[PDB]
Amino acid sequence: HMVEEVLEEEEEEYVVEKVLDRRVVKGKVEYLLKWKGFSDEDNTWEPEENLDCPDLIAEFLQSQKTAHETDKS
Numbered sequence: 001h002m003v004e005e006v007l008e009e010e011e012e013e014y015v016v017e018k019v020l021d022r023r024v025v026k027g028k029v030e031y032l033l034k035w036k037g038f039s040d041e042d043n044t045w046e047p048e049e050n051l052d053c054p055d056l057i058a059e060f061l062q063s064q065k066t067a068h069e070t071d072k073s
Helices: 054-060
Strands: 015-024 029-036 044-047
Touching: 015 054
Parallel strands: none
Antiparallel strands: 015 029, 029 044
């Protein structure tokens, strides 16, 4: 922890590994993705009106229909 009057940015930058789930509060939609570069699973919730990953959002919201019932085994 560095104490000073010139440090607001949380960290350099985080990366997204994929989407694990999601949850709405009542007006906005949040998404819990797996952010790599922390400890192992520091997923975080973000607003879909700012994030930029419509591939995992529209790819994970369809799995609920049927995807784990098959799998590649």
